[PDB]
Structures are given as structure tokens and as C-alpha cells.
Write a protein that binds this ligand. Sequence first.
Ligand SMILES: O=c1[nH]cnc2c1ncn2[C@@H]1O[C@H](COP(=O)(O)O)[C@@H](O)[C@H]1O
Ligand SMILES: O=c1[nH]cnc2c1ncn2[C@@H]1O[C@H](COP(=O)(O)O)[C@@H](O)[C@H]1O
Ligand SMILES: [Mg+2]
Ligand SMILES: [Mg+2]
Ligand SMILES: [Mg+2]
Ligand SMILES: [Mg+2]
Lengths: 158, 158
Amino acid sequence: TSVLFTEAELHTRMRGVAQRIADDYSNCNLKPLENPLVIVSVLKGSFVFTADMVRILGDFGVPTRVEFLRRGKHVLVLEDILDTALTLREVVDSLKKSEPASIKTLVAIDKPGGRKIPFTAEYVVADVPNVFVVGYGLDYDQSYREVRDVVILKPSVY
Amino acid sequence: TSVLFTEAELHTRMRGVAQRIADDYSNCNLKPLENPLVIVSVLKGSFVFTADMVRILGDFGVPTRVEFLRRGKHVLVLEDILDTALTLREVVDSLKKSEPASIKTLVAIDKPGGRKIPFTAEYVVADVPNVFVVGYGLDYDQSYREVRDVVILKPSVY
Ligand SMILES: O=c1[nH]cnc2c1ncn2[C@@H]1O[C@H](COP(=O)(O)O)[C@@H](O)[C@H]1O
Ligand SMILES: O=c1[nH]cnc2c1ncn2[C@@H]1O[C@H](COP(=O)(O)O)[C@@H](O)[C@H]1O
Ligand SMILES: [Mg+2]
Ligand SMILES: [Mg+2]
Ligand SMILES: [Mg+2]
Ligand SMILES: [Mg+2]
């Protein structure tokens, strides 16, 4: 239907978030191999957002190391969209059982109007009202993930 | 150490490969939902290459649908680097057991000098001599995947 955020808008916001992550993780001072920022990507839709974000965080002095879902290290969980927050709440708690060092959440699209439980992400790229969107990893039955922009799908499509 | 291919060089080659994939898959005429090009991404290093490639293939009229590793549909397997070809050979044969429609391989970095078995990819972004490279998804012990370019690592690093 209509475009909510373009690839240029997302990358601009992700650069601003990257500068915050660079400043907030300075006293940890991340270096490759020895002390990398462990990136936990929640498949599938997060792979587009994860691929761009790690290439931007490296541009800002933050070396990263990625893991894919579905101790003593600093963990940043990345998900494409934050809606009911039921999946991210279970993932964060499951990662706290391994006892890291500092765990935070970074989402690309946050829909606060769809929460089933209270949950706040430490870093949010953009906010979206309670409407169904596709693109930038988001799908409707495994399609439209490859759209470079976050758009609202036509009702006749679904 | 030195840079072999930059992000600009890769995306330029990936646009040329995308035009070939668009022409070679015309008689299949891919449409979203009903007839999508099934993208099989081999984790982990392929996630950077997969995220860029699906956003380029959509730019060329090729809608895609992604699956991640580690019937009757057209399948294109994507891997970050092609070296011994032992993993990709086993993956292709395992996907042929599901009886698709047309299966091909697309790799970002092909090292022909490291083959343990004969294997040719249908689509290759760039060729690299038998040297250890990092960046663009490639790693040395889960680090340096976030480098925007394919570079050779300093020997003192490893
Ligand atoms: O706006 C959207 N666009 C794409 N996916 C969404 C959107 N809102 C929720 N989802 C995802 O849809 C799934 C929930 O759908 P359900 O499992 O059919 O109830 C979860 O993976 C959500 O992250
Ligand atoms: O040039 C390289 N850069 C990054 N990874 C490589 C390179 N060459 C081979 N690999 C990967 O290294 C792995 C093989 O290493 P091994 O399992 O220690 O023998 C496979 O996943 C290969 O794809
Ligand atoms: Mg999600
Ligand atoms: Mg879905
Ligand atoms: Mg590989
Ligand atoms: Mg490796």
C-alpha cells in the first residue's frame, strides 16, 4: 500500500543508534576476538537487519560476533520487529541463564501497540503503529522480505 | 593485510549476476507467494551475502524466499565462500532428495584452488586465489564478518 520507512531512513536511524551503542559500550571497549559484542540474531526476518547493523557498528568502532536463533560476554539481541514481545522476552531470559556480562535488546521496527506483556527495548530504530508491515526482513508467509523499505501490504494481497 | 574486493565491487558484480539470474529464470517467471525463488542460505557467513543479494534480485524482478541451513519449486543455494566444496556438495544432494524443479548454486567468493572434489557454481560473484580472506560474512573464529570488504588477514592476527 504505502511506504513507512525507506532504506535510507533506516540506515540513517541505524547510524544514530550505532553512535549510541558506541558511546554506551566504551567502558567495555570492545576488541575483535578477545572482547567482541555478541550479536544474537533471531531468524528469519532479522537477517537483513543484522547484516546491515554489523556493517554499521564496525564503522563506529564496535566489533561484533553473530549468532542465530531459530557467558561473561556482552550480549546485544537483535530482532526485526517487536510486537507482542513474547518471543524476545523468552529469548532474553534464556540468555540470562548463561550469565553474560551486559544484555540489551536492539529492534529495527517497534510496534508498542501490540504488546501482550510490558517490554522496552534499549535501542529502537523506528516506531510503527499497530499495522501489518512487510519489507526489510519482514514477511507475509515467507515473501516480501527482500523489499528494501518497510511498507504496508495491500489488503487484497492477504 | 590487503583488500581484494570492496563492497562497491561486490555489489557491482552482484548486479551483473542478478541480471543473469533474471534472464535465466524468465521462463519460470517468478511471482511472490505462488512461485518464489527459494533462497537457501548456509549459515553463518552467508547471511551478509544473502541479505544484499535478495535486495538486489528484487530490484531485478526476481522475488525470493529465504531459508537458513546450519518440493516442485526452483531452488538457488547461496554460500559465502566455495573452497573444498564438500559442504555445498552435500547440501545440494540433500536438497535434490526433496525433488525441486531447478537447483543451482550462487557463491560470493569462489576459491577454485582449494577444491577437494570437482564442483562448479552456476553463478560466481568473484574469484579469489587460495589465500585466507575475511570480511563480507567470512570470519576467523567468528570475528571480522562485519568488514564491508573481502580482505586478507595479517598473519600475526592468527
Ligand atoms: O507487522 C508485521 N509484519 C511482519 N511480521 C509481523 C508483523 N507483526 C507481527 N509479525 C510477526 O508475526 C508473527 C506472529 O504471527 P502468528 O504466529 O501468526 O500469530 C511473529 O513472528 C511476529 O514477529
Ligand atoms: O578464506 C577463507 N576465509 C574465511 N573462511 C574460510 C576461508 N576458507 C575456508 N573457509 C571456511 O573455513 C571452514 C573450514 O575450516 P576447518 O573446518 O577448520 O577445516 C569452512 O567453513 C570454510 O568455508
Ligand atoms: Mg521477530
Ligand atoms: Mg512471519
Ligand atoms: Mg561456507
Ligand atoms: Mg568459520
